[PDB]
Design a protein around this ligand. Structure first.
Ligand SMILES: O=c1[nH]c(=O)n([C@H]2C[C@H](O)[C@@H](COP(=O)(O)OP(=O)(O)OP(=O)(O)O)O2)cc1-c1cc2ccccc2o1
Ligand SMILES: [Mg+2]
Ligand SMILES: [Mg+2]
Ligand SMILES: [Mg+2]
Length: 540
DNA sequence: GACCACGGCCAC
DNA sequence: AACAGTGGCCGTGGTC
């Protein structure tokens, strides 16, 4: 940890390493070091020294394991003090912040990162002695999960590049037509992408009324909620919303994604961040593949670009009404449990209410609208906003929210119990004991307290569902290798797999069973599954 | 070139 | 916009 011994290190040492850049699939490995006892080992040539390691044990283990897979080396991740910190407090999200909480410094030298990994592991493992529930989540979920994510990251997903490039041009021509239509209505040209320029045109030059203001700077907002509020008080607004949709999808997905294909795989490689969220969810970045478009007809065209290798099929599995089922288990609502022990669909039921139509005539776009509504209401939405999203008088929306919860009395009782317990203990917890600390529950400004309250009772629900999915991933991944299949993506309550066409149907059937039986609840988990040549087909 | 705050908006 | 929650990436506008 200050003293130096010749490479290689002894078995079980802690590793540090420096990458030329944050993405492991794209990084040059600039330095590799390892630490054990009172000694640090430094490698003369980093790529060769990788061959010597049996596992990756230390800070950001998964990242080094991914780079090793890229080179054809099986170097699974083992212990990672970031995972210990994240289980102790999920505000622990980066090495910089962990080190300056638990007794070190994160620099840019591999040998220091290795010596830091050594101490940070000893400190945090000691803080976890006696937290049997957190130790369980570390050994049975997070640590084995890191290996699953490393393989997902190194495998990647195939993308139809020539398609997206052709699509970029069709979208550009439609963007330019819309720009010209707005310029004409404004009587002049300007930067439609400049929020501040648009504000002035809409609210000063034209007379349009300003419905709301931005948070930090108090400017007149031009957000969709504001604009759609007057989608007919001027047609220009209508075109602006269509321009925004198109430019958003072009600059975020259509244009950048094609330029991210890796030269040695032919595929697109995301990163699955395991200590990035306050609830236990994963996140995805560089690029985010958890927010690929899907809701609009153009977003659908984009999602179709995600395709199976030649000779394989994509398999898509998605839990049914997942947080609603979890809520049933957590709250013990007899009436809510029943709903699911009878195969009812509350998303479909709210849509039938919303659109005045029998359950037989709800289509997939209707039910999507009802999902946002049902979860909006659930987690604390206000009567006022609902009346505005649903386009109905204030008093009509007040009432749905009343009936929504009368249905299931035990829910509000579980909310209040969770908060009281969170006020007493400092934190709220998932079914498996994952914690989120929420101090503001006893803040003296109502607005701050009530926000903390909404964050606080959402966490056990969203975080239990994430625990279940993570555990499902951990159980499923060994069965996929034995069938010659691959795990490609996770989108919170959804998995995408890639399987040989000859094994696709068996793989689907199997993955569904594992997901549904991951951890029986007081309510059955149902999983929808589809198979197709592309990401969209598989979700149908 | 690198970093940042902000408004805004995609997904779950 | 807002008494829904959880993320990450865009362009703009700005500094060093
Ligand atoms: O606005 C939201 N707020 C929120 O907190 N979530 C959470 C809660 C859900 O259980 C979980 C998984 O989401 P999801 O798989 O899409 O939905 P569900 O599992 O409940 O239902 P199903 O699979 O169709 O049967 O994500 C989702 C949405 C939402 C709204 C929407 C509209 C379109 C497409 C997806 C959507 O997602
Ligand atoms: Mg679902
Ligand atoms: Mg889903
Ligand atoms: Mg730069």
């Amino acid at each position: 940890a200050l003293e130096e011994a010749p490479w290689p290190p002894p078995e079980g040492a802690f590793v540090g390493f420096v990458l030329s850049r944050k993405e492991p699939m794209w990084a040059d490995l600039l330095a590799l070091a390892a630490a054990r006892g009172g000694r640090v080992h430094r490698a003369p040539e980093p790529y060769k020294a990788l061959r010597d390691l049996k596992e990756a044990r230390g800070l950001l283990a998964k990242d080094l394991s991914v780079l090793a897979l890229r080179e054809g080396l099986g170097l699974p991740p083992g212990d990672d003090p970031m995972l210990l910190a994240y289980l102790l407090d999920p505000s622990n999200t980066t090495p910089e912040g962990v080190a300056r909480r638990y007794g070190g410094e994160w620099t840019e030298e591999a040998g220091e990162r290795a010596a830091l990994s050594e101490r940070l592991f000893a400190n945090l493992w000691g803080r976890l002695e006696g937290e049997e529930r957190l130790l369980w989540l570390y050994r049975e979920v997070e640590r084995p999960l890191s290996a699953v994510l490393a393989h997902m990251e190194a495998t990647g997903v195939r993308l139809d590049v020539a398609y997206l490039r052709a699509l970029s041009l069709e979208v550009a021509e439609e963007i330019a037509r819309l720009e010209a239509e707005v310029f004409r209505l404004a009587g002049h040209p300007f930067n439609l992408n400049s929020r501040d320029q648009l504000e002035r045109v809409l609210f000063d030059e034209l007379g349009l009324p300003a419905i709301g203001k931005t948070e930090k700077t108090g400017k007149r907002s031009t957000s969709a909620a504001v604009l759609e509020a007057l989608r007919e008080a001027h047609p220009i607004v209508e075109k602006i919303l269509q321009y925004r949709e198109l430019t958003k999808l072009k600059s975020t997905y259509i244009d950048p994604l094609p330029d991210l294909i890796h030269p040695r795989t032919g595929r697109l490689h995301t990163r699955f961040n395991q200590t990035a969220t306050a609830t236990g969810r994963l996140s995805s970045s560089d690029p985010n593949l958890q927010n690929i478009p899907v809701r609009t007809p153009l977003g659908q065209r984009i999602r179709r670009a995600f395709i199976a290798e030649e000779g394989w099929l994509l398999v898509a599995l998605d839990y049914s009404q997942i947080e609603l089922r979890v809520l049933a288990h957590l709250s013990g609502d007899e009436n809510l449990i029943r709903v699911f022990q009878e195969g009812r669909d509350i998303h479909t039921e709210t849509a039938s209410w919303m659109f005045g139509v029998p359950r037989e005539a709800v289509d997939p776009l209707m039910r999507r609208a009802a999902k946002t509504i049902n979860f909006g209401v659930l987690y604390g939405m206000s009567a006022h906003r609902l009346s505005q999203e649903l386009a109905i008088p204030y008093e009509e929306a007040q009432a749905f929210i009343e009936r929504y919860f009368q249905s299931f009395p035990k829910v509000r009782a579980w909310i209040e119990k969770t908060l009281e317990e969170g006020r007493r203990r400092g934190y709220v917890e998932t079914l498996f004991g994952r914690r989120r600390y929420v101090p503001d529950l006893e803040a003296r400004v109502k607005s701050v307290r009530e926000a903390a309250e909404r964050m606080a009772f959402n966490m056990p629900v969203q975080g239990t569902a994430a625990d279940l999915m993570k555990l499902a991933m951990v159980k499923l991944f060994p069965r996929l290798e034995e069938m010659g299949a691959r795990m490609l993506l996770q989108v919170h309550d959804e998995l995408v797999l890639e399987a040989p066409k000859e094994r696709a149907e068996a793989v689907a059937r199997l993955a569904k069973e594992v997901m549904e039986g991951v951890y029986p609840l007081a309510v059955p988990l149902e999983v929808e599954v589809g198979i197709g040549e592309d990401w969209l087909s598989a979700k149908e």
